[PDB]
Amino acid sequence: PPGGGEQEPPPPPAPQDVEMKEEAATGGGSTGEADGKTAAAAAEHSQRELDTVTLEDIKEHVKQLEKAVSGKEPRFVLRALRMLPSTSRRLNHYVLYKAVQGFFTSNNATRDFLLPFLEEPMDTEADLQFRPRTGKAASTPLLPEVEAYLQLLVVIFMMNSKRYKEAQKISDDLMQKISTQNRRALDLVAAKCYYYHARVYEFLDKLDVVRSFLHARLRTATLRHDADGQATLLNLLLRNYLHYSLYDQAEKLVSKSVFPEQANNNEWARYLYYTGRIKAIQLEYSEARRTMTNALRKAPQHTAVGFKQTVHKLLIVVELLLGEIPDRLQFRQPSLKRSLMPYFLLTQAVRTGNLAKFNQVLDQFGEKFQADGTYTLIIRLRHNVIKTGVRMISLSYSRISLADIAQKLQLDSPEDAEFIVAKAIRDGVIEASINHEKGYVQSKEMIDIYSTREPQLAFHQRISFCLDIHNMSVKAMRFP
Template sequence: MAPTEAIMDVDMKDVNSPTTETETEVPKKDVDTVTTEDIREQLRQVEKSVMTKEPRFVFRVLRSLPNTRRRLNQVVLRRIIHHSYGAANKDKESLLNIVGGDESMEQASPLQRARSNKQGSLAPLPEVDAYIHMLVLLHCIDNNRIQEGIVCSDHLMQKIVAQNRRTLDLLAARCYFYHSRTYELASKLDTIRSFLHSRLRTCTLRKDFEGQAVLINCLLRNYLFYNLYDQADKLVSKSVFPESGSNNEWSRYLYYLGRIKAIQLEYSQAHTHLLQAIRKAPQHTAVGFKQTVQKLLVTVELLLGDIPERKLFRQSTMRYALAPYFQMTQAVRLGDIHRFNKVLETYGNMFQADHTYTLIIRLRHNVIKTAIRAISLSYSRISLADIATKLMLDSAEDVEFIVAKAIRDGVIEALLDHEGKFMQSKESIDLYSTKEPQVAFHQRIAFCLQIHNQSVKAMRFPPKAYNKDLESAEERREREQQDLEYAKEMAEEDDDGFP
């Protein structure tokens, strides 16, 4: 039996060997060729969207843009430019100069060369032209070629301004964002502010909701970049953000709105806007955006007197980004002035980069209030000099004013003796006999109702989906004719039943 099994094994190997050789003979395409084919398919989808007037094909292309962006290089872009533009087209030479490289980097087939020469000066569709320019702009941004990116972006904006096509609106909205991003990297955001305002007026008149949403966010980011909070607030009050805007644009808008309200001491509204921004943000991506929002949200919660949950700081995506804010939260919770000053000194530059330094400076009063509340609960009577020692303040007179303000704000229940220079705490009362449980319960109910209303408003349906169940005029006539015939048959049957 053993020799037979050996022969069978050898036969099986001989049978399988040609298949393996066939599989190895199939040539594998390199990454640049696959990327070029994918972009060509995207260009066909854009053309299909223009011909059929269906924006969903452009949506599909824009959704795949992050993946395409990671695979862009000079070889791919030069192939796409040669494939899309004629030999005598003016844009072809300018784009090739921006991309860089030389002819030796390309491996275009003779068929593609002949097609490019045959096209002559024929230009692609404006939508295809805008998409190719946007890809070149993204390549410049990712490779830190800001000056070339500015040239490409200005050229792209000139093309978009000259067009008035509804099929170009979605691509134009994305181009506005990258145009603003390019000038932000060059620290020249103030130079395009008037251009963004003019485009916002145009998009508002043309009912271009996506472009309107993107331009409002670009203007808000422009103002906040230079700390022009008053002008940003005026823009919010004078403009209406479109409800049909995408969730990503809504997330950005709510974040900017939260920053404005926080600076204006409207912490409750800022907290509401920031929570909505996190809920509308993508669940599995945009980690950097969610980290930025959480940093501001933690600061606002501390200013409101609340302590964020510890599990927030333990998340894998938030642990390192929120480490300074976790130490700040511990200092505020314990009312430790020394620890607060140490954290502020250590991470001051990081707080300034996060645009939370101004708000964190305000937390000093919260730390003092927390410390005074802890002291009032621990001591029934304590001198102002001892309070100054515990709070590491210079004089007892400053402590007297701080304690008086805490009593007036309802932070503590105590009496202040000016002549005796001491603070005497009142007996603690039953918390459930006050209105605090009712207020907390009301906040929870309002929060749940708000989520329900926002979920209902966020529901999306296909356009004219209700027409599927409705019958046409011809079908209605046929149904009525059948009903009449059926009624006559029923009448005849009734007549036959009664002679």
């Protein structure tokens, strides 16, 4: 007891130091940043908030544990008050209550008592200015607390957060409206909480009404104030409207627009993966392979760990339907390895045309595919592999006989081979002529693609791609 008793006091000062100065330096700093300039936004503290919340989402959040009473949530949410420069006294009173945890017997004011606490910035009379700071006070205590996931009676407090922070949404739409620049700072905060909206419902029931409530904030951001706001709302749509039926696939046509400009960076990179799985159910491979490839190369920085790895797993799924794929272990990660083992040997059976090997993969490894929901392709991927097998042979040989390729690709009969080659010509896969007597297939080398034709015509898209980046560099140069 004396050994562990003396080690209890030291830690809580650590949240009283860094976690204090988290919203003391940033929040007190963003005060003057959100009072003016306010260009854009920027307000880089809102992006610095991405380097805090996501950092806090591991440690320490607000709590924790660490060996405190979880009294940081009531501390900053009380006594806002605020006014002219005496707001420093509020930060000074935040230092005064630090000794309360270390001296007296500490008491936990979270949970049940957090209901009037979120009303206090309104009850302090008055805020009087920044809702994003109170939105932060209605989120950063509660939303990182959602990671506990105890599911008992505190989920309605997570809903009470989504209630009183919807009262912040009431102050979001009603207040300002003219050169706000807090909404663009809130578009990062409103995004997150709307993400936590979707997350909290997934543990109880998927949201039917919030789907209607999503289009509310969706449509109302147009055209008055929209920067990055509708994109994050469109991400909420395509995320869940994918996993749940129906008709949401073709919905992307009337929504886009794009919506420009893509923000922020990797945030829009995953969006191409979302519509990527969509366009995969449209059966169009070519537009799906370019949006999936662009989804990996445009996505920084990780780690950790498998969040980027699992999304990359199902990303190369469109490559299984392309018909041209290499062995995917070049994309393997030691952490993703154990999870991709049932999905690994799959593509290894795609490179071969054996039915007994391909069907054995579906039987044993089909259990892993149930969680992915990828069973739509397994019926049409049989027709994809037979195109890869015939392309391997047709590219390796000038002439290929139907009887020799019959059992080599084990089509087993001459009649269905005439049906496959016919549809292969219909799809433009093979140029082979066929001489029908028994019959047999006699092809010839295809040429004249040459030099003067394809490379210089493709270079029209290459330079038009490059000369636009010259403007992209100038536009990016004009901001500094």
